[PDB]
From a paper:
In the present study, we first report that bufexamac is a selective inhibitor of LTA4H, a crucial enzyme in the LTB4 biosynthesis pathway. Bufexamac significantly inhibited the activities of LTA4H aminopeptidase and epoxide hydrolase with the IC50 values of 15.86 and 11.59 μM, respectively. A high resolution crystal structure of LTA4H complexed with bufexamac was resolved to reveal the interaction between bufexamac and LTA4H. Structural elucidation of the interaction of bufexamac with LTA4H revealed that the carbonyl and hydroxyl groups of bufexamac were bound to three key residues (Glu296, Glu318 and Tyr383) and the Zn2+ in the active site of LTA4H, blocking the access to the substrate channel of the active site. Bufexamac also interacted with Tyr267 by a pi-pi interaction. The investigation into the structure of LTA4H complexed with bufexamac revealed that bufexamac competitively bonded to Zn2+ in the active site, thus preventing the approach of endogenous substrate LTA4. In this study, we observed that bufexamac exhibits dual inhibition activities against LTA4H aminopeptidase and epoxide hydrolase. Thus, the unexpected inhibition of the aminopeptidase activity of LTA4H provides a novel insight into the mechanism of allergic contact dermatitis caused by bufexamac.
LTA4H is a widely expressed bifunctional zinc metalloenzyme with epoxide hydrolase and aminopeptidase activities using the same Zn2+ in the active site. LTB4 is a metabolite of arachidonic acid (AA) in which leukotriene A4 (LTA4) hydrolase (LTA4H) catalyzes the final step in LTB4 biosynthesis. LTA4H is a bifunctional zinc metallopeptidases, which cleaves the endogenous chemotactic Pro–Gly–Pro that has a role in aminopeptidase activity, leading to the resolution of inflammation, whereas the epoxide hydrolase activity of LTA4H plays a role in the generation of LTB4, a potent chemokine for neutrophils. During the hydrolysis of LTA4 into LTB4, the Zn2+ of LTA4H binds to the 5, 6-epoxide moiety of LTA4 and initiates the chemical reaction in which the introduction of water occurs distant (C12) from the epoxide ring (C5/C6) and a unstable cis double bond is generated at ∆6 (between C6 and C7) in LTB412.
Residue numbers in the entry: 4 to 610
The structure:
């Protein structure tokens, strides 16, 4: 049972295709159009069905050229409102019909952010983007909003003619709009069956530049050159990923760099990965986010979680593949470094939620829980840890990659649960079942807290980070003079980041240590968003008032939740910055992404 959806389940009927015709209205902040769903009955004598919607205005429902009866049930919070549709003729099993729904979105759609000209780089044109994962596609169009159902789609999108529309699909041409010559119609086709969470749309003043044989980068003009360089390892990562996962089935692999309010690092929208501009460090140092999104082209997008309870399938495998991509490019020692980092991030989350908290389980029960609220590092890092543990248990990365490739082939184009995975794992490694039965499955899959076993990690690149962190934690005032810019000379940006992560785990430090740190290392000057994030948190937690304006500025000039939520939270826990944090949130809230605005609100306990 998909407890996040109110639609008829896949055992009742299945959407096979969506044909979307819509118009982007920036004056009203509405998408208006029709969604034509090809629905296949899985039951005899099917006479009605239910779709998910959220803040949608329904004009009418047409089947076989006539209007039919439908009703909208009462709103169930974050899930939206169920739309029951009365079919004009009962369907037999496997019979397909086309249901055409005339609809309009609310300007408050949780799927969308509408940005004025002034919130953009160019300042002349407005901009729209979507984000459907997990359950926001229902706030764009009526659908069975569950990853247990996969469909193909085609779409025609009318926008002001100076702007460009893109979607999670192959571009299928453009023409002037016949009903309105100030407008253009862009067309799209996604021939590979996808869950509806992977439907994506951006409209804006976009330009493109080619950076590989199957990759354009898109952004506003101001960010094009920088983006093309930042993501130039993209084709080499695709070739590695194809080696590990099998053929890339999606045609194009394009990247879109969003405005700073994009709430996540990246979103694996098929044919068109969306990424945060906070990746634009200038040195390709945050490209592991690209490797991750690329990896979703197999784990997630081809093999998909049947419900959001099994989100770890999607993320943990993706992190496992990601780290392999980075290990092939940068060395196995770097894969171990990144893995060990991930463990530290898992320790942080577990500490934050509490070691008995239900959201620290690998398989989570989402009944009555908003997926946005449960969202954390856990499914990424506990999932990765489980798979790295298995790798070590079963004979090494070469053997485990053979399983992962067979897993992808096996479950391509399907949606699966943790039991499906587990049973395939047992089938594939049947000569090592004895080893597998040593695994504490109940603990790994269903218990809260840190996993019962920690894998083994190479320490080569981590040692320097720990040693410097330890020098600073154990320093007294009379040791502060011995620190110097030369301490950093052999450290990469990744190692600088891990030094701060290590230090931050023991925060607060004395204020005079943090001041010395700025004096000798000049972390204030670093623009790498990961480093800057962790440094500013370290400042605020150690009660440095000078860091307040810097933290507020970072929290609000970009909107990547990973950064914005802990920055606001730290600012709200510091008594000197508390009132300003809340004031700043209230002032920015209307111009924030709707999900981000919601979550920052809960974190700060303000309404
Ligand atoms: C329950 C899930 C809700 C949040 O959705 C999302 C969570 C994370 C991402 C980034 C990435 O590629 N890994 O996920 C994108 C959407
Ligand atoms: Yb075509
Ligand atoms: Yb039209
Ligand atoms: Yb302000
Ligand atoms: Zn992911």
């Amino acid at each position: 049972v998909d407890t996040c959806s109110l639609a008829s389940p896949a055992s009742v009927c299945r959407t096979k295709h969506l044909h979307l015709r819509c118009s982007v209205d920036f004056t009203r902040r509405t998408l208006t159009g029709t969604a034509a769903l090809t629905v296949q009955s899985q039951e005899d004598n099917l006479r009605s069905l239910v779709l998910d919607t959220k803040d949608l205005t329904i004009e009418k429902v047409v089947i076989n050229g006539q209007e039919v009866k439908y009703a909208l049930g009462e709103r169930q919070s974050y899930k939206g409102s169920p739309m029951e549709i009365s079919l004009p003729i009962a369907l037999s099993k496997n019979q397909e019909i086309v249901i055409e729904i005339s609809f309009e979105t609310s300007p408050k759609s949780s799927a969308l952010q509408w940005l004025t000209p002034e919130q953009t780089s160019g300042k002349e044109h407005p901009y729209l983007f979507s984000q459907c994962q997990a359950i926001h596609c229902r706030a764009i169009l009526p659908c069975q909003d569950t990853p247990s159902v996969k469909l193909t789609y085609t779409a025609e999108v009318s926008v002001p003619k100076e702007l460009v529309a893109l979607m999670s699909a192959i571009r299928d041409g453009e023409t002037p709009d016949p009903e309105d010559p100030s407008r253009k119609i862009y067309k799209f086709i996604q021939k590979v069956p996808i869950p509806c969470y992977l439907i994506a749309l951006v409209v804006g003043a976009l330009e493109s530049r080619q950076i590989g044989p199957r990759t354009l980068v898109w952004s506003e003009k101001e960010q094009v050159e920088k983006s093309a360089y930042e993501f130039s390892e993209t084709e080499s990562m695709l070739k590695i990923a194809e080696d590990l996962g099998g053929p890339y089935v999606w045609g194009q692999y394009d990247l879109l760099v969003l405005p700073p309010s994009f709430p996540y690092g990246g979103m694996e929208n098929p044919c068109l990965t969306f990424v945060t501009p906070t990746l634009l460090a200038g040195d390709k140092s945050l490209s592991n986010v690209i490797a991750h999104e690329i990896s979703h082209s197999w784990t997630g997008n081809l093999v998909t979680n049947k419900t959001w309870d099994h989100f770890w399938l999607n993320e943990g495998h993706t992190v496992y593949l990601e780290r392999h991509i980075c290990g092939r490019l940068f060395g196995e020692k770097f894969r171990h470094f990144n893995a060990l980092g991930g463990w530290g991030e898992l320790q942080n989350s577990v500490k934050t939620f509490g070691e008995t908290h239900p959201f620290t389980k690998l398989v989570v029960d989402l009944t009555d829980i908003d997926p946005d609220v449960a969202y954390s590092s856990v499914p990424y890092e506990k999932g990765f840890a489980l798979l790295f543990y298995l790798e070590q248990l079963l004979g090494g990365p070469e053997i485990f990659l053979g399983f992962l490739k067979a897993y992808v082939e096996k479950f391509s184009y399907k949606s699966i649960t943790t039991d499906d995975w587990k049973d395939f794992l047992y089938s594939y490694f049947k000569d090592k079942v004895d080893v597998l039965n040593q695994v504490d499955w109940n603990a790994w899959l269903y218990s809260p807290g840190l996993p019962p076993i920690k894998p083994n990690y190479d320490m080569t690149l981590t040692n320097a980070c720990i040693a410097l962190s330890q020098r600073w934690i154990t320093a007294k005032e009379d040791d502060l003079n011995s620190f110097n810019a030369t301490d950093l000379k052999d450290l990469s940006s990744h190692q600088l980041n891990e030094f701060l992560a290590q230090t931050l785990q023991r925060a607060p430090l004395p204020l005079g240590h943090i001041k010395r740190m700025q004096e000798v290392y000049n972390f204030n000057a670093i623009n790498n968003s990961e480093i800057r994030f962790r440094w500013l948190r370290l400042c605020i937690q150690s009660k440095w008032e000078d860091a307040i304006p810097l933290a507020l500025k970072m929290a609000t000039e970009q909107g990547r939740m990973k950064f914005t939520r802990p920055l606001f939270k730290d600012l709200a826990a510091f008594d000197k910055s508390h009132d300003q944090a809340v004031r700043t949130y209230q002032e920015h809230k209307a111009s924030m992404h709707p999900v981000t605005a919601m979550l920052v609100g809960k974190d700060l306990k303000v309404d």
